[PDB]
């Protein structure tokens, strides 16, 4: 039975099973990456014959979002549990994604606005999904020992989804749009 | 005409028409359940012939949070204005609804990847909503009594939310990936 | 290369080059106001023949949206960076549409749930966000001076959303539906 009603006065545990308030800063910031990986799995259920090529790796930021936000859920100073999350292996993965997308698409110096395929805008509601998570898991940081392997990787993850909603674009020969304001930027 | 230009500078009002900041607690508070209400009903209109059977109860639940959202704008100490949202007979509905979901689907012992079907993901962009909106009530009541009968419902309705997400799949033939990490938790 | 990794720790920059962490709430605001426009590129993305009237506005949300983004990036104290946005003809012309809307649509006394097609479903989200993001640029306005012409526009872009989002059902011949426990308010 999944409801415990544990929760039903507005407290609840984190790793270790210390009891914090539901708006307390660390639980908002693994809320923040769960909502983020409810919207990645939204975004992959969105792939068709000419985007199959981004399903694999979505899965594999959902699995790597759970491993983010179980060390968001473990505070520091319990030697029983441990962090988990390493960032080298995960983060070197997207800079190879974000390489090889920046390549293949047109270069622009401007911002563009975010949109064009379904799954393109997806994937840019993703990334501003995951710049919302950051800052949650900044406000903990400024407040409590994180792991900051975590931030690395979320930190990058939004330029991932900044060149995967390009890349997804392409796949559909739809081209991006400049912001009819910008300077050259990039 | 809808626009009034009354909160062009940032304040608005609650029920019994005091002025507060657009940033207040309790205007954050029922904004967010209004963001997850919008969220229903985009949910819903994914429902596809497959999936009909869920439409009805989305439906109530857009229901049941204008009325959650109408006491989150009460403010407990004017008494011209009544709270109206009693937790037991909807909540009840919510528990019936998870059980026999939970009963129908394959059980697992792990958490689950949050996707599959185009609906099964968005019942967990519910799931995750209805939680960020639980945290800013869980900071509004903080600060001010609140009618603590939402509390109860709107932490069970996410657990609804994750039991209907994974009866969507099932009835789309779609299995729940699990998280590749997880201990056995449930 | 879009990532410089100079963010790694949880700091950015905002216009004029000074450096803020990013849970700051100048950074939340034009973050939420990104977030917006993302969502306005997926709703945009949802058109179809039914609903191709409404393109060249929602695009044109996603350009003002960059306009207010960019000036509330833009500390009020270096007077090297001005502001750009001006709400008057951006705003009249949010009005003319909502008169319009509202106009063509069967009149409401009652709230009505936000849903109907994907459309009109997704006009409501963009509608909430916008609300999500007007509270954090009254957070910003309430700490540090602001381009109150931006609050403004935000303001009434909500009110537009909800003006479209009825416009959405009715292009589609989708009923909206009454909340049961409204009154009058309208
Ligand atoms: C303002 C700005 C934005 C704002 C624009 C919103 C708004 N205000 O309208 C927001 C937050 C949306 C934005 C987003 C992004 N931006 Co920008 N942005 C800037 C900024 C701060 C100023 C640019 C400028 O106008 N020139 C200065 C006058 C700079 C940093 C700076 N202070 O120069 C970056 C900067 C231009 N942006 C950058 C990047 C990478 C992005 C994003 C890809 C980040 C992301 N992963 O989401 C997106 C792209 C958005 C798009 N749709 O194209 C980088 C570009 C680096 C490069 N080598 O290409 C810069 C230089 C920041 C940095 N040093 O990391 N950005
Ligand atoms: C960490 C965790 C999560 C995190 C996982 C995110 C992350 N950190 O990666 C988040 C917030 C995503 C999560 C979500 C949920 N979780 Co969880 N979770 C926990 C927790 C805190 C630790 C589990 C663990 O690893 N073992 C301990 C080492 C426990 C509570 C606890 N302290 O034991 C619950 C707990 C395992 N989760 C629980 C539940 C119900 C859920 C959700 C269904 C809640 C919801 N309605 O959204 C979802 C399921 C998510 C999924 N996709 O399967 C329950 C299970 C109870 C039961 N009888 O089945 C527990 C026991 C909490 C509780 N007591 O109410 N959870
Ligand atoms: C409570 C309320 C809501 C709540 C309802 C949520 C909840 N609590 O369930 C929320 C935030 C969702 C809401 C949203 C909106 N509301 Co309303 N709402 C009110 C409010 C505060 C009380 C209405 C009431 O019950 N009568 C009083 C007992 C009034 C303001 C007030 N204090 O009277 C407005 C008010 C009724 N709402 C108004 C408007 C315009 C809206 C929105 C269109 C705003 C928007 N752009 O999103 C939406 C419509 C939502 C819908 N789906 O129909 C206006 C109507 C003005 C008019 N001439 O038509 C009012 C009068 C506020 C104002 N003065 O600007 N609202
Ligand atoms: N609103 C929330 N936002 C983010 N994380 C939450 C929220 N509520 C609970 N949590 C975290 O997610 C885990 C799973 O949530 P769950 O809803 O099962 O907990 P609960 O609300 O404390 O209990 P219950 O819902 O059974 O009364 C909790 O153990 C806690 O770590
Ligand atoms: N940004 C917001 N977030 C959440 N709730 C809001 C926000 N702005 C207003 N409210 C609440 O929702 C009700 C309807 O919003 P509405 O936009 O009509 O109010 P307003 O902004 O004060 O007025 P107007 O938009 O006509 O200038 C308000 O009466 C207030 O209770
Ligand atoms: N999480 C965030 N939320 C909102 N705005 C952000 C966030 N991170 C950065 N910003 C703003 O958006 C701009 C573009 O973001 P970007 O991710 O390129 O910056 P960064 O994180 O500081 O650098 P990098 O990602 O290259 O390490 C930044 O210059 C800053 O103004
Ligand atoms: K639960
Ligand atoms: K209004
Ligand atoms: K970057
Ligand atoms: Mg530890
Ligand atoms: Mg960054
Ligand atoms: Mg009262
Ligand atoms: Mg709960
Ligand atoms: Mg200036
Ligand atoms: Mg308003």
Same mark, same amino acid.
């Given at each position: 039975?999944?409801?415990?009603?544990?929760?039903?006065?507005?407290?609840?545990?984190?790793?270790?099973?210390?009891?914090?308030?539901?708006?307390? =800063?660390? !639980?908002?910031?693994?809320?923040?990456? /769960?909502?983020?990986?409810?919207? %990645?799995?939204?975004? *992959?259920?969105? @792939?068709?014959?000419?985007?199959?090529?981004?399903?694999?790796?979505?899965?594999?930021?959902?699995?790597?979002?759970?491993?983010?936000?179980?060390?968001?859920?473990?505070?520091?100073?319990?030697?029983?549990?441990?962090?988990?999350?390493?960032?080298?292996? =995960?983060? !070197?993965?997207?800079?190879?994604?974000? /390489?090889?997308?920046?390549?293949? %698409?047109?270069?622009? *110096?401007?911002? @563009?606005?975010?949109?064009?395929?379904?799954?393109?805008?997806?994937?840019?509601?993703?990334?501003?999904?995951?710049?919302?998570?950051?800052?949650?898991?900044?406000?903990?940081?400024?407040?409590?020992?994180?792991?900051?392997?975590?931030?690395?990787?979320?930190?990058?993850?939004?330029?991932?989804?900044?060149?995967?909603?390009?890349?997804?674009?392409?796949?559909?020969?739809?081209?991006?749009?400049?912001?009819?304001?910008?300077?050259?930027?990039?």
């Amino acid at each position: 039975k999944i409801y415990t009603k544990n929760g039903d006065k507005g407290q609840t545990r984190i790793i270790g099973k210390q009891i914090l308030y539901k708006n307390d =800063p660390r !639980v908002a910031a693994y809320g923040e990456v /769960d909502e983020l990986n409810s919207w %990645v799995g939204y975004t *992959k259920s969105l @792939i068709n014959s000419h985007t199959q090529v981004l399903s694999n790796e979505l899965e594999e930021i959902q699995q790597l979002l759970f491993d983010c936000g179980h060390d968001l859920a473990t505070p520091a100073d319990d030697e029983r549990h441990s962090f988990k999350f390493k960032q080298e292996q =995960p983060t !070197v993965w997207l800079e190879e994604k974000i /390489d090889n997308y920046t390549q293949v %698409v047109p270069a622009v *110096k401007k911002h @563009i606005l975010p949109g064009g395929t379904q799954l393109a805008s997806a994937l840019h509601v993703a990334r501003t999904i995951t710049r919302r998570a950051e800052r949650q898991i900044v406000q903990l940081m400024r407040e409590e020992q994180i792991n900051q392997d975590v931030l690395i990787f979320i930190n990058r993850l939004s330029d991932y989804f900044f060149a995967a909603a390009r890349y997804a674009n392409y796949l559909e020969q739809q081209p991006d749009m400049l912001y009819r304001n910008s300077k050259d930027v990039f």
